[PDB]
Amino acid sequence: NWTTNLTQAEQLAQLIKEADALVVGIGAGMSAADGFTYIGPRFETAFPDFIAKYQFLDMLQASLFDFEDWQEYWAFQSRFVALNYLDQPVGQSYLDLKEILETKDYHIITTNADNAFWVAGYDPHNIFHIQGEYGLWQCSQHCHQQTYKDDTVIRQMIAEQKNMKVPGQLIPHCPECEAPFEINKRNEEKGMVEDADFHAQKARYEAFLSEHKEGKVLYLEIGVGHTTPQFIKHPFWKRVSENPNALFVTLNHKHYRIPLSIRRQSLELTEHIAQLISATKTIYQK
Template sequence: MEKTSWHVLSNGEYLTASSKLSMALDEADAVLIGVGAGMAAADGFTYAGPRFTQNFPDFIEKYRWLDMFQASVFEFENLNEEWSFFSRFVDLNYMSQPLGESYIRLKELLEGRNYHIITSNADNAFEKAGFDKNKVFDMQGKYNLLQCSKGCTPKRYNNEELMKDMIDRQRGMKVPDDLIPYCKECGAPMELNRRNHTDWMVEDARFFKEQKLYKQFLQEYADKKLLILELGCGYMAPQVIKHPFQNMTENQSNSLYMTVNLKDYSIPQNIRNRTIWLQEDIKDLLLNIQQEQQFTKMNFYETEQ
């Protein structure tokens, strides 16, 4: 297929970051969005700093953890202590996590466009913001779900009521024995539904439906003018979003790879001519676009009057 040119590449040299993103969105036939931890952090949902120290002071005092990433892969002394931590973790990062302003702005920005989202975040940000669940692929699992630690059954179970009970009844960094969940099929301990260091997790019918819809989107727009937009994706799990997105850009000559990240990550040489790196804070970037669009609409309305 003949290669399609992107005006934002040839004419965007002196544009602001927000104008480049707006222009690319308007040019695209469809938008593929990859969302990583940087997007959550932009809205203040960080795994370090006061958010961590204020919610886990007892664990930090005992184990000298530096952040929730370190804590979430820690080998606990027993299941009672493990679930004392993870019940608070799930509440903080799923059940009680507030509505993210950037997610609302992203939803408004995508209104009326053909898009699909893949995320490595396991929180509730997209649900809370009211995104169409059939357009979001939670590749790395969900904090509000449990799975058998041995994977004996392809089932995931909601854990929210259990987490609330654990929070209410935990004492001295431990939950009571009767609250520790075990698999009803094989008796093994249950754990949070999240992809571990061996790249494994339980994947149920809902997961495979999300995966199918995601693949259908990729197939539908494989030869179209596709904006591949990466928001806050780093190298903690590059095999989930970053590397597939870069490979897609290389193999689809009509695609444009746009990455938004404050950190300086190397771009493969063979896609640099179809890459735009916006070294911007995601929250500020989306706010600027929203304000620019509101200003444009206001001027249009005044002109029409």
């Protein structure tokens, strides 16, 4: 039962059923498993101009790049926001996971910033977007702690850009200091704008953790890579260490070495995330 000859799906369905609570951490692998990829034809088709100019390898590298000027920044980012936030369709793995989680006491933390939880109909009170969202903007000088949005301006930038530049008059500026807006994103050097809504999410996530310091708590980590381990992977390892009755189950095909203090509490499930979540749902619902 509560331990880390069954298939991966069978094992995962058994653990979720037996769990007292789930703390679910979701990264980029879950969206890639549903087809929302950041390398290969999806990127090449969407950004052939930028790829030819800069030799970008992938769409995540491109989204972090320090572009030539704000006209170029917004030409790239407007198209990036439409692809990954305004028009990205619902993912089946998100729907399948939701059907499982709605039977459980759970909370989600994600380093993703796409629309996936919203088009799949998740309750925003149960999700912490710790790395912001592509649909939001912040002052580029971080001059005050408020986020903004304007999807109509995004569509105008897509329609009116030419030659990798938005017209200068379309660039949006902060009302407080007149610096250009930028996408709400976290930088190592500058941090992120963290407004009232961000803190309300963080408080809900911290309250759920405080209620589940004991018991059969399943720390379920889905598609979380190496990029920013301080937000999900490392804190999950620490929570599992601190609660000897917790379990760490990671859906991943890279075999990151688990800390000694959680070796007896850890399981790696390597099967393709979409197919694994689908198979687990079918077992779980009977």
